[PDB]
Amino acid sequence: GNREDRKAKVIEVLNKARAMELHAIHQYMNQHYSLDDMDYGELAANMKLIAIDEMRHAENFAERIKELGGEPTTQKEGKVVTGQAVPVIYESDADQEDATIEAYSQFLKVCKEQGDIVTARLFERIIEEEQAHLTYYENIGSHIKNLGDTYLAKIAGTPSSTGTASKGFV
Amino acid sequence: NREDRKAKVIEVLNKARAMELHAIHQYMNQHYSLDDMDYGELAANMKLIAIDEMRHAENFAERIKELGGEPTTQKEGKVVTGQAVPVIYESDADQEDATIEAYSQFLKVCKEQGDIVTARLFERIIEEEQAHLTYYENIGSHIKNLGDTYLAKIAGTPSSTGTASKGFV
Amino acid sequence: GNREDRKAKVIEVLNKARAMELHAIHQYMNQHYSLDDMDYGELAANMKLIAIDEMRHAENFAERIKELGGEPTTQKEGKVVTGQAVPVIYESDADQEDATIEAYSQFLKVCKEQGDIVTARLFERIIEEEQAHLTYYENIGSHIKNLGDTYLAKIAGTPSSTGTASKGFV
Amino acid sequence: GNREDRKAKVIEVLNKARAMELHAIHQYMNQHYSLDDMDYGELAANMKLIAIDEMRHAENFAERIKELGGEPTTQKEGKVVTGQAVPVIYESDADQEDATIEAYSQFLKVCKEQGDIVTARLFERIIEEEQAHLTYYENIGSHIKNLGDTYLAKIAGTPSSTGTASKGFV
Amino acid sequence: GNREDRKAKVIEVLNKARAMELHAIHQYMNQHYSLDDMDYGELAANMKLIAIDEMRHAENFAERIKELGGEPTTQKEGKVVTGQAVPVIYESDADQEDATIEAYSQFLKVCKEQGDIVTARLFERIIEEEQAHLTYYENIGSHIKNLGDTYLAKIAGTPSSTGTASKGFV
Amino acid sequence: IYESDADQEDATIEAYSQFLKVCKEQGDIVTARLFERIIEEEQAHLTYYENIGSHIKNLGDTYLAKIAGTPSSTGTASKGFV
Ligand code: FEC
Ligand code: FEC
Ligand SMILES: [Fe+3]
Ligand SMILES: [Fe+3]
Ligand SMILES: [Fe+3]
Ligand SMILES: [Fe+3]
Ligand SMILES: [Fe+3]
Ligand SMILES: [Fe+3]
Ligand SMILES: [Fe+3]
Ligand SMILES: [Fe+3]
Ligand SMILES: [Fe+3]
Ligand SMILES: [Fe+3]
Ligand SMILES: [Fe+3]
């Protein structure tokens, strides 16, 4: 395609990815709110830290969309599922991460076909992070299935802190 | 009637929370524009205010959970994009004023429902919303009275909001 | 081809890239001398710092050329334009960086086609640095376009320091 | 026997021991990859730490063989068993350690018979370390046997770190 | 092909790579024992440090295989040549590293064809380390060729230490 | 549920053994035989609760999936007045 054609094709997959991150942020934070309510500290903390990774993916996608002359979407891709039980959280989060990695690896092929090396590299780095998320969700899911409440009894009452309060305006 | 009272508070908490989710997306959309323009200082403060709204959304969600509700995931109203710089501050100033009005109403319900803990949460957040309002009012005024003279001062300034966000990876 | 052919094809695009770097070094330093003479310190400093990134690029390209048995070129690609006014400096530097990314992306392709993974990673790294340079030049060109002498008035008489004198022999 | 007769008999028990070490390295690292995959951090870490002792043993046997003028073998003794369940891992590793102590004690007797005091002291030191491995594996197999999933729930999700990465070349 | 098919084809080239690392570890350590015996310390030190790099590669390949649900091989590919003279050591090691880089670049392509970005990145990073190994071996070969016993006289009696002993279990 | 009930039955058998002893000291053979009979039934409860508790602790979800949706009938309705 011409210069504009290529930019538009990449801005499209970037916005698709961004909508996926916007979904994960609301989905993972919903789950964090449940986990925190159950007082499963370590689990709630790590869920919020992964959601913050997704916020940063969302931001990186938007920044690159701006670099290419586009407008960052404000809509999340899909619907947020609430009230999930603990076994369901980790099962569905692992599935979701695996799907994202499949999706982003195709998005990557698009960028390479449209000759956009900078965007392809963004996708490669974020796919490596999604892999870290997948592995985490799978490990929790497997202990829960194999060890049940014995494992959860260990997590009950642990600290849920994610560190010092974040940089804000006030 | 404990359950009527929890239900009516949870309803305004979810209302305020959806106003926070909209604000987060609205202010970050403007942040990306300001950053693209290379008006660093303005871009940095717009993201810092977005992060304040994230913290409001979270506090509202946690209280909703304490009251046995489900925190909403949907934002109230539409995000406006491609806003020009004068419109960003004018519209952010208007939305912050509308939020203080809305939350003072929500505060009222909390007090009527005998929910002191939630009333205090709204009072605290309202005073932060006033800090944001004042900020947006001041920037809008400078832009209106000094125009490009004020912007040349913002051009090229750093946009960093601090050290990278705590994460999982 | 055999090993020699594939190496020779990569040496050819590395030396074309290197020739483009040698050009950018002389073109950006020429502009640096003007910016400095005009006493727009921050602009002059950053133009020289970008010039030094290009020096490092030229060096990295020649090191890879050496690894593959080739000889690093000493000729620059193209003519250095002198006497440019400030708006023209940033307009043409952004065009030149954009063109470089275009070119290096093709070169990247050659590397992949010849099975040279180490050389492909070098171009990938360097293209991301060029993207940073592109953004900088676009950003300046936009302030000059939108704010003109009101913006340059803020830059007038700023420090032009790029730091302590670079390591030398004497 | 004669001087070279004596060296050769020692070199032979040394090469038998070294082949047992090469096997141990691959057998315990295999178990480590499984324990790690299962996310039993503390079990995975100590398993890798023991394999690294076996690496040191292999190396010390090889340095002594060179001293005696022999050639250190490069072939492991026996087959590596894969897919073992957790109890079989600790059951089989303890038997392997007990067997190694037995063989090594016989190798030690050969060194004394061949009047090789330095090599015998090498065996003495290593048998003491193998005794430390044996006790370890017997202890874990005993907890798994007595406490089962309750013990494993405790290890689930523990850190698997064995320290800072290897000294290496790059 | 299907998801399971795609994992199977990547697991196969990962086990091919790992078997090559297992060979390199035994090959390089074998040469390390000769150089140490010869009291060429700097050479013995670096050869062992490169062998530790290959250990880390084998480990990284094993971990990815596990992530993909495969079983890490325990067998090395090819025969370890022993009794090499010093010049033969560096010629063959250089030749061995270039061949590794050729093979790994092929394995990389399979990863890409199977849509496995995380595994392609793993190979990309290890190919860069192998290139550092290749340059090293080529440089020592050049010095032995160009300077002979003069260069060896320099290395004679040098420290052979690779630092502090590796944390282990005992 | 099963952890606590096992402990409860174990406590009951210990207490009733002590009560049985008081009956023997008061020369009340009929009452002691009553405790004897009921202690043997408490032992069957204890054994029941300990076995379930073990399966839950050790086998988790596969065990409960077997119990999910099974019949909960305890037989024909109790004799009553109506
Ligand atoms: C809470 C909460 C919400 C609401 C979730 C919900 O559904 O309730 C929540 C929602 C969002 C949403 C959307 C976005 C995406 C904005 C967009 O791209 O349109 C979104 C975007 C960002 N968040 Fe966010 N948030 N958020 C935190 C809390 C919450 N956040 C905390 C805490 C930190 C702390 C970071 C730190 O300390 O390093 C934090 C950081 C960021 C960064 C900072 C990136 C960086 O500089 O590295 C970006 C961008
Ligand atoms: C000696 C010796 C042998 C025997 C070879 C022979 O043929 O004699 C030897 C053999 C092996 C073999 C196989 C493997 C591959 C195992 C497998 O994946 O099946 C194998 C695997 C590893 N070794 Fe190994 N060794 N080895 C050292 C010495 C020796 N090593 C020293 C020293 C360190 C010190 C590490 C450090 O402090 O960084 C060290 C560390 C490692 C690590 C950990 C690296 C890391 O975490 O970064 C892994 C994995
Ligand atoms: Fe993400
Ligand atoms: Fe993710
Ligand atoms: Fe707010
Ligand atoms: Fe606000
Ligand atoms: Fe360059
Ligand atoms: Fe450049
Ligand atoms: Fe040993
Ligand atoms: Fe041992
Ligand atoms: Fe390697
Ligand atoms: Fe290598
Ligand atoms: Fe009972």
Side-chain angles (χ1 to χ4, degrees), chain A residues 98-99 101-102 105 108-109 112 121 123-124 127-128 131 135 138, chain E residues 3 6-7 64 67 112-118 121-122 124-125:
Chain A
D98 175 85
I101 287 162
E102 283 288 89
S105 302
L108 211 175
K109 212 197 302 253
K112 301 189 138 166
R121 288 290 296 126
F123 270 115
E124 295 177 23
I127 289 159
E128 287 187 278
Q131 184 54 252
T135 298
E138 281 175 351
Chain E
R3 294 293 305 268
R6 291 160 62 206
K7 287 177 164 100
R64 187 53 182 154
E67 293 189 337
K112 287 201 254 213
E113 299 173 330
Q114 306 302 315
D116 195 346
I117 301 319
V118 166
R121 293 281 305 116
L122 173 57
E124 280 170 35
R125 291 171 172 148

Short mmCIF file of all heavy atoms in Angstrom, two decimals, chain A residues 98-99 101-102 105 108-109 112 121 123-124 127-128 131 135 138, chain E residues 3 6-7 64 67 112-118 121-122 124-125:
data_model
loop_
_atom_site.label_atom_id
_atom_site.label_comp_id
_atom_site.label_asym_id
_atom_site.label_seq_id
_atom_site.Cartn_x
_atom_site.Cartn_y
_atom_site.Cartn_z
N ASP A 98 -3.93 -16.58 26.93
CA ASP A 98 -3.50 -17.36 25.77
C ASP A 98 -4.10 -16.81 24.48
O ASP A 98 -3.43 -16.78 23.45
CB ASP A 98 -3.91 -18.83 25.95
CG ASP A 98 -3.58 -19.64 24.71
OD1 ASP A 98 -2.43 -20.10 24.59
OD2 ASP A 98 -4.48 -19.80 23.86
N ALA A 99 -5.36 -16.38 24.55
CA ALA A 99 -6.04 -15.82 23.38
C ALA A 99 -5.41 -14.52 22.91
O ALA A 99 -5.25 -14.24 21.73
CB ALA A 99 -7.51 -15.57 23.73
N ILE A 101 -2.38 -13.68 23.34
CA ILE A 101 -1.07 -13.93 22.74
C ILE A 101 -1.22 -14.42 21.30
O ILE A 101 -0.42 -14.04 20.45
CB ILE A 101 -0.24 -14.93 23.57
CG1 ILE A 101 0.30 -14.33 24.88
CG2 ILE A 101 0.90 -15.47 22.73
CD1 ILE A 101 0.72 -15.39 25.88
N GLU A 102 -2.26 -15.23 21.06
CA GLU A 102 -2.57 -15.66 19.71
C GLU A 102 -2.94 -14.45 18.85
O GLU A 102 -2.43 -14.29 17.74
CB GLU A 102 -3.73 -16.65 19.68
CG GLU A 102 -3.33 -18.05 20.11
CD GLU A 102 -2.48 -18.74 19.06
OE1 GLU A 102 -1.24 -18.60 19.10
OE2 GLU A 102 -3.07 -19.42 18.19
N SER A 105 0.06 -12.09 18.22
CA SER A 105 1.04 -12.65 17.29
C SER A 105 0.58 -12.51 15.85
O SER A 105 1.39 -12.40 14.92
CB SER A 105 1.31 -14.11 17.67
OG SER A 105 1.77 -14.15 19.01
N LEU A 108 1.10 -8.79 14.97
CA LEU A 108 2.52 -8.64 14.71
C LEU A 108 2.84 -8.89 13.24
O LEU A 108 3.55 -8.13 12.59
CB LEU A 108 3.33 -9.60 15.56
CG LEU A 108 4.72 -9.19 16.02
CD1 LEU A 108 5.26 -10.27 16.96
CD2 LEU A 108 5.69 -8.97 14.87
N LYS A 109 2.32 -10.00 12.73
CA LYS A 109 2.46 -10.33 11.32
C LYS A 109 1.95 -9.21 10.43
O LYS A 109 2.50 -8.87 9.39
CB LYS A 109 1.68 -11.62 11.03
CG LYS A 109 2.28 -12.47 9.93
CD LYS A 109 1.33 -13.51 9.37
CE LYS A 109 0.77 -14.50 10.38
NZ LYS A 109 1.37 -15.89 10.23
N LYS A 112 4.48 -6.47 10.37
CA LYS A 112 5.66 -6.79 9.55
C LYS A 112 5.32 -6.71 8.07
O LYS A 112 6.11 -6.21 7.26
CB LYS A 112 6.20 -8.17 9.94
CG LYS A 112 6.58 -8.22 11.43
CD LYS A 112 7.31 -9.51 11.77
CE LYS A 112 8.49 -9.23 12.70
NZ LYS A 112 9.02 -10.47 13.32
N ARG A 121 7.92 -4.48 17.05
CA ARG A 121 8.72 -4.64 18.26
C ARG A 121 7.88 -4.35 19.50
O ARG A 121 8.02 -5.05 20.51
CB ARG A 121 9.95 -3.75 18.22
CG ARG A 121 11.01 -4.23 17.24
CD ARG A 121 11.68 -5.51 17.74
NE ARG A 121 12.41 -5.30 18.98
CZ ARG A 121 12.28 -5.96 20.11
NH1 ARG A 121 11.39 -6.94 20.22
NH2 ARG A 121 13.03 -5.66 21.17
N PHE A 123 4.78 -5.02 19.81
CA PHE A 123 3.96 -6.23 20.02
C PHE A 123 4.81 -7.36 20.55
O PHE A 123 4.40 -8.08 21.47
CB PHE A 123 3.26 -6.63 18.72
CG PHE A 123 1.88 -5.98 18.57
CD1 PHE A 123 1.64 -5.08 17.55
CD2 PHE A 123 0.85 -6.29 19.44
CE1 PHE A 123 0.40 -4.49 17.41
CE2 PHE A 123 -0.40 -5.72 19.31
CZ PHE A 123 -0.62 -4.82 18.29
N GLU A 124 6.02 -7.56 20.03
CA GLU A 124 6.87 -8.61 20.59
C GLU A 124 7.16 -8.44 22.08
O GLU A 124 7.11 -9.41 22.84
CB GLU A 124 8.19 -8.67 19.82
CG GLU A 124 7.99 -9.10 18.37
CD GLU A 124 9.27 -9.09 17.56
OE1 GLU A 124 10.35 -9.20 18.18
OE2 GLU A 124 9.16 -8.97 16.32
N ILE A 127 3.93 -9.18 24.08
CA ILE A 127 3.66 -10.63 24.08
C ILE A 127 4.53 -11.37 25.09
O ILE A 127 4.12 -12.29 25.79
CB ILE A 127 3.84 -11.26 22.68
CG1 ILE A 127 2.74 -10.87 21.68
CG2 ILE A 127 3.93 -12.77 22.80
CD1 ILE A 127 3.13 -11.04 20.23
N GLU A 128 5.79 -10.98 25.22
CA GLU A 128 6.60 -11.55 26.29
C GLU A 128 6.01 -11.25 27.66
O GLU A 128 6.10 -12.06 28.58
CB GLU A 128 8.03 -11.01 26.17
CG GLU A 128 8.74 -11.65 24.99
CD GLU A 128 10.20 -11.26 24.95
OE1 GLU A 128 10.51 -10.16 24.46
OE2 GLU A 128 11.01 -12.09 25.41
N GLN A 131 2.88 -13.55 28.27
CA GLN A 131 3.39 -14.88 28.62
C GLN A 131 3.68 -14.96 30.11
O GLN A 131 3.37 -15.95 30.80
CB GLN A 131 4.63 -15.15 27.77
CG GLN A 131 5.29 -16.51 27.89
CD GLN A 131 4.33 -17.66 27.64
OE1 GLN A 131 3.95 -18.38 28.57
NE2 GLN A 131 3.91 -17.87 26.41
N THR A 135 1.60 -17.72 32.44
CA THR A 135 2.30 -18.63 33.35
C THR A 135 1.84 -18.41 34.78
O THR A 135 1.64 -19.39 35.52
CB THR A 135 3.83 -18.48 33.26
OG1 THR A 135 4.26 -18.81 31.93
CG2 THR A 135 4.55 -19.47 34.17
N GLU A 138 -1.88 -19.81 35.12
CA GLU A 138 -1.83 -21.27 35.08
C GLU A 138 -1.29 -21.87 36.37
O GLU A 138 -1.81 -22.89 36.84
CB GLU A 138 -0.94 -21.72 33.92
CG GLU A 138 -1.62 -21.66 32.56
CD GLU A 138 -0.68 -22.00 31.43
OE1 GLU A 138 0.54 -22.12 31.66
OE2 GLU A 138 -1.19 -22.14 30.30
N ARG E 3 -3.13 -26.04 17.37
CA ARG E 3 -2.37 -25.56 18.52
C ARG E 3 -1.37 -26.60 19.00
O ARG E 3 -0.19 -26.33 19.20
CB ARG E 3 -3.32 -25.19 19.66
CG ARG E 3 -4.23 -24.01 19.34
CD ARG E 3 -3.45 -22.71 19.22
NE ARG E 3 -2.62 -22.42 20.38
CZ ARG E 3 -2.97 -21.70 21.44
NH1 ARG E 3 -4.17 -21.15 21.51
NH2 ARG E 3 -2.09 -21.51 22.43
N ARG E 6 1.40 -27.05 16.43
CA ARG E 6 2.35 -25.94 16.46
C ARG E 6 3.31 -26.10 17.63
O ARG E 6 4.50 -25.86 17.44
CB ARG E 6 1.62 -24.61 16.52
CG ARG E 6 0.86 -24.29 15.24
CD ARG E 6 -0.22 -23.26 15.50
NE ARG E 6 0.35 -22.00 15.97
CZ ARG E 6 -0.31 -21.13 16.73
NH1 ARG E 6 -1.56 -21.39 17.09
NH2 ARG E 6 0.28 -20.01 17.12
N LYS E 7 2.82 -26.50 18.80
CA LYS E 7 3.70 -26.73 19.94
C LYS E 7 4.67 -27.88 19.68
O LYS E 7 5.86 -27.83 20.00
CB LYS E 7 2.90 -27.04 21.20
CG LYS E 7 2.20 -25.83 21.78
CD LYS E 7 1.34 -26.19 22.98
CE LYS E 7 0.97 -24.94 23.77
NZ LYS E 7 -0.42 -24.49 23.45
N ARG E 64 11.49 -23.62 28.31
CA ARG E 64 10.49 -23.36 27.26
C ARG E 64 9.77 -24.64 26.85
O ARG E 64 8.54 -24.68 26.70
CB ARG E 64 11.16 -22.68 26.07
CG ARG E 64 10.18 -22.20 25.00
CD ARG E 64 9.10 -21.32 25.61
NE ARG E 64 8.10 -20.87 24.64
CZ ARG E 64 6.85 -20.55 24.97
NH1 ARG E 64 6.42 -20.63 26.22
NH2 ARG E 64 5.97 -20.14 24.06
N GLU E 67 7.27 -25.37 29.37
CA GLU E 67 6.14 -24.45 29.19
C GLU E 67 5.22 -24.95 28.07
O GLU E 67 4.01 -24.75 28.13
CB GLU E 67 6.60 -23.02 28.88
CG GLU E 67 7.32 -22.31 30.01
CD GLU E 67 7.60 -20.84 29.82
OE1 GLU E 67 7.67 -20.31 28.69
OE2 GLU E 67 7.77 -20.15 30.87
N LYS E 112 8.82 -19.08 13.84
CA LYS E 112 8.01 -18.03 13.22
C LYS E 112 6.85 -18.64 12.43
O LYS E 112 5.71 -18.18 12.54
CB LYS E 112 8.87 -17.12 12.35
CG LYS E 112 9.77 -16.19 13.15
CD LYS E 112 10.22 -14.98 12.35
CE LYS E 112 11.68 -15.04 11.91
NZ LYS E 112 12.31 -13.69 11.85
N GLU E 113 7.18 -19.67 11.65
CA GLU E 113 6.19 -20.39 10.86
C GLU E 113 5.14 -21.03 11.74
O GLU E 113 3.98 -21.18 11.32
CB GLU E 113 6.87 -21.45 9.99
CG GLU E 113 7.89 -20.89 9.00
CD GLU E 113 8.67 -21.98 8.28
OE1 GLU E 113 8.89 -23.06 8.86
OE2 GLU E 113 9.07 -21.74 7.12
N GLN E 114 5.49 -21.43 12.96
CA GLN E 114 4.50 -22.02 13.86
C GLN E 114 3.84 -20.95 14.72
O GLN E 114 3.15 -21.24 15.69
CB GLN E 114 5.15 -23.10 14.72
CG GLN E 114 5.87 -24.14 13.86
CD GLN E 114 4.90 -24.79 12.88
OE1 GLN E 114 3.79 -25.17 13.24
NE2 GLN E 114 5.33 -24.91 11.63
N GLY E 115 4.06 -19.68 14.37
CA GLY E 115 3.46 -18.59 15.13
C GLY E 115 3.87 -18.61 16.59
O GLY E 115 3.02 -18.41 17.47
N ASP E 116 5.14 -18.84 16.89
CA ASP E 116 5.59 -18.87 18.29
C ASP E 116 6.63 -17.77 18.52
O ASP E 116 7.84 -17.97 18.41
CB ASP E 116 6.14 -20.24 18.67
CG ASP E 116 6.29 -20.46 20.16
OD1 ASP E 116 6.22 -19.50 20.96
OD2 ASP E 116 6.50 -21.63 20.56
N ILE E 117 6.12 -16.57 18.82
CA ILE E 117 6.93 -15.37 19.03
C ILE E 117 7.81 -15.47 20.27
O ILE E 117 8.97 -15.09 20.23
CB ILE E 117 5.99 -14.15 19.16
CG1 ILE E 117 5.11 -13.94 17.91
CG2 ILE E 117 6.77 -12.88 19.48
CD1 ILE E 117 5.87 -14.20 16.62
N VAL E 118 7.28 -15.99 21.37
CA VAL E 118 8.08 -16.13 22.58
C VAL E 118 9.27 -17.04 22.33
O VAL E 118 10.40 -16.76 22.73
CB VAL E 118 7.24 -16.68 23.75
CG1 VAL E 118 8.13 -17.15 24.90
CG2 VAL E 118 6.24 -15.65 24.23
N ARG E 121 11.91 -15.40 20.14
CA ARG E 121 12.72 -14.39 20.83
C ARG E 121 13.84 -15.08 21.61
O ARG E 121 14.96 -14.55 21.57
CB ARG E 121 11.92 -13.50 21.77
CG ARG E 121 10.93 -12.59 21.08
CD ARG E 121 11.60 -11.36 20.49
NE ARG E 121 12.36 -10.64 21.51
CZ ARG E 121 13.68 -10.49 21.48
NH1 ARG E 121 14.41 -10.99 20.49
NH2 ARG E 121 14.30 -9.82 22.44
N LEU E 122 13.52 -16.18 22.25
CA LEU E 122 14.49 -17.02 22.95
C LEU E 122 15.67 -17.37 22.05
O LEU E 122 16.84 -17.24 22.39
CB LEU E 122 13.84 -18.30 23.48
CG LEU E 122 14.80 -19.32 24.10
CD1 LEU E 122 15.61 -18.70 25.23
CD2 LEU E 122 14.06 -20.55 24.59
N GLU E 124 16.49 -15.83 19.26
CA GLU E 124 17.16 -14.61 18.83
C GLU E 124 18.21 -14.19 19.86
O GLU E 124 19.33 -13.83 19.52
CB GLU E 124 16.19 -13.44 18.67
CG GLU E 124 15.39 -13.42 17.38
CD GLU E 124 14.30 -12.36 17.41
OE1 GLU E 124 14.55 -11.30 18.02
OE2 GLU E 124 13.21 -12.58 16.84
N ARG E 125 17.82 -14.24 21.13
CA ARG E 125 18.74 -13.81 22.18
C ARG E 125 19.93 -14.75 22.31
O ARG E 125 21.07 -14.34 22.54
CB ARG E 125 17.98 -13.68 23.51
CG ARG E 125 17.00 -12.50 23.48
CD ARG E 125 16.08 -12.48 24.70
NE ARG E 125 15.31 -11.25 24.74
CZ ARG E 125 14.08 -11.14 25.22
NH1 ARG E 125 13.48 -12.21 25.71
NH2 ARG E 125 13.46 -9.97 25.21
#
